[PDB]
Amino acid sequence: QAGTTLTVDLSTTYQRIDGFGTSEAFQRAVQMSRLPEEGQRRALDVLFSTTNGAGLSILRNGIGSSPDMSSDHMVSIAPKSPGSPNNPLIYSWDGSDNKQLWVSQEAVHTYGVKTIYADAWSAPGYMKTNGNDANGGTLCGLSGAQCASGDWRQAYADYLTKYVEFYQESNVTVTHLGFINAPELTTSYASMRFSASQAAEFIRILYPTIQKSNLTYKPTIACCDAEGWNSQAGMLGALSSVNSMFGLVTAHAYTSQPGFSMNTPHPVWMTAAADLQGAWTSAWYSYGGAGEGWTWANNVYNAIVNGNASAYLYWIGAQTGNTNSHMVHIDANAGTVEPSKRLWALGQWSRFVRPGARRVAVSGASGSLRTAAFRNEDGSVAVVVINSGGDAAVNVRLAPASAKAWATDNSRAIEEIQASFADGVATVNVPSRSMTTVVLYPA
Numbered sequence: 001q002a003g004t005t006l007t008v009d010l011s012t013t014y015q016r017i018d019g020f021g022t023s024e025a026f027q028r029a030v031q032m033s034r035l036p037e038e039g040q041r042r043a044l045d046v047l048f049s050t051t052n053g054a055g056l057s058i059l060r061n062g063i064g065s066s067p068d069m070s071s072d073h074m075v076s077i078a079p080k081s082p083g084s085p086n087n088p089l090i091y092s093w094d095g096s097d098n099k100q101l102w103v104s105q106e107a108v109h110t111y112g113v114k115t116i117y118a119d120a121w122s123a124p125g126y127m128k129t130n131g132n133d134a135n136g137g138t139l140c141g142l143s144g145a146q147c148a149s150g151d152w153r154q155a156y157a158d159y160l161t162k163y164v165e166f167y168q169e170s171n172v173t174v175t176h177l178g179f180i181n182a183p184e185l186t187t188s189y190a191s192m193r194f195s196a197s198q199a200a201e202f203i204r205i206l207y208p209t210i211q212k213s214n215l216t217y218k219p220t221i222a223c224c225d226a227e228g229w230n231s232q233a234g235m236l237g238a239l240s241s242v243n244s245m246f247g248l249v250t251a252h253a254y255t256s257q258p259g260f261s262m263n264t265p266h267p268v269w270m271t272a273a274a275d276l277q278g279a280w281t282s283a284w285y286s287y288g289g290a291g292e293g294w295t296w297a298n299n300v301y302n303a304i305v306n307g308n309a310s311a312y313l314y315w316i317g318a319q320t321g322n323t324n325s326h327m328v329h330i331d332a333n334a335g336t337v338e339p340s341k342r343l344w345a346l347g348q349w350s351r352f353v354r355p356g357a358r359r360v361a362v363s364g365a366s367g368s369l370r371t372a373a374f375r376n377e378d379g380s381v382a383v384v385v386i387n388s389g390g391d392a393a394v395n396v397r398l399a400p401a402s403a404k405a406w407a408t409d410n411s412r413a414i415e416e417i418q419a420s421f422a423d424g425v426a427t428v429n430v431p432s433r434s435m436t437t438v439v440l441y442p443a
Ligand SMILES: *[C@@H]1O[C@H](CO)[C@@H](O[C@@H]2O[C@H](CO)[C@@H](O[C@@H]3O[C@H](CO[C@H]4O[C@H](CO)[C@@H](O)[C@H](O[C@H]5O[C@H](CO)[C@@H](O)[C@H](O)[C@@H]5O)[C@@H]4O)[C@@H](O)[C@H](O[C@H]4O[C@H](CO)[C@@H](O)[C@H](O)[C@@H]4O)[C@@H]3O)[C@H](O)[C@H]2NC(C)=O)[C@H](O)[C@H]1NC(C)=O
Pocket: 015, 016, 261, 262, 263, 264, 265, 266, 267, 268, 308, 310
């Protein structure tokens, strides 16, 4: 009764955490590149810094499919048809990749990010049944997708391998590689329709292409960036024959929520979520609205604890405009960068739950407290406390030599709070309507 005691049971383990992150696809990287130098550095710091930012540990890039950079389109490394799929692809590398190469180089070389996930939303138009990287259509040569122009399946595998090679030659290792996005959805923008059976057919072609290549690191193939857990779970049966040839399951949080554990041997990443419809809000908590930082801290909780996610990526990091599609507002007029409390929600996770952490059991939670715990590779134990009540006296212990704690709330952005430590037990005052992380350090 001297506070509520949370007890971590290290002997009960769950999934590994690969990390937390976002994207700068569809020219959002270009928006960041336009800022003055101080704004560029502030945007990169708030995304990736483990000292003064969210410490995001994963970057997701788009493999551009478009003929040019009209609108927000991502130009392809091979934007012009070679006529026949038997002819060498025509590579036209611009040394930029829609400004994503720069963001990647900063993430890796400046901030120590080690996980780079490159995903194509479509093949180039000349490889597809409709001849266009937009408006759906399918990769020519897959079962049920004949094209007058012939079979482009091996050409698409060669093209994806070459994109990874261009990154390698620019000193960035792509670690994970996707070849579809929302394969169940036709849209006005870059989109491509594959069945689950077609995804397995293509993995059988892509895997040996990667393995035979001159790539120094062979990236892990991912599938399939469906728009929700329910749609992705429907694809896993057909994928199971190629489980030896890919190593990551990906899905978003749009058409359904990440609320159950999918039946796959692979780690599962939630690779895109956002309040796409909402006008810009910056607040941590007011009433649990769809754009509030509090809401997003709880969305991450749900994906990890209920959805068995090993990673969580918000859709976009920094971009211009007054929607909640992003975490960090760019004001091009002012040359300024202003994080929302959605950035700090994701960072309140990512700063303390580092890649390779193992989720472990913690008991003592309640109506007012939701808790989760993570054992980092360095032996630190991060205990997440999401508090929907008033200030709460909490003790945190293992069933350690020191402790620290940080909170995010309406007044704090991952700000240190007192963690009073005696004989292995941390005592904190978890602020009202906060997400607090208490970290127990080993001797
Ligand atoms: C939440 O999400 C996580 C993923 O993030 C899910 O974790 C996965 O859980 C499954 C089920 O427990 C794990 O599968 C098991 O893996 C073990 C370990 O295999 C490795 O080490 C073995 C030595 O200890 C070794 O023999 C294995 O080698 C084989 O497998 C590799 C890989 O396929 C292959 O290359 C080799 O040639 C071998 O064939 C491997 O290196 C494995 O031992 C399990 O199988 C045995 O035991 C089961 C009974 O538990 C039995 O039924 C089998 O017949 C067999 O005897 C099994 O495959 C998987 O590794 C986890 N994935 C990750 C990434 O951690 C988790 O399940 C999700 N939770 C929920 C609630 O859904």
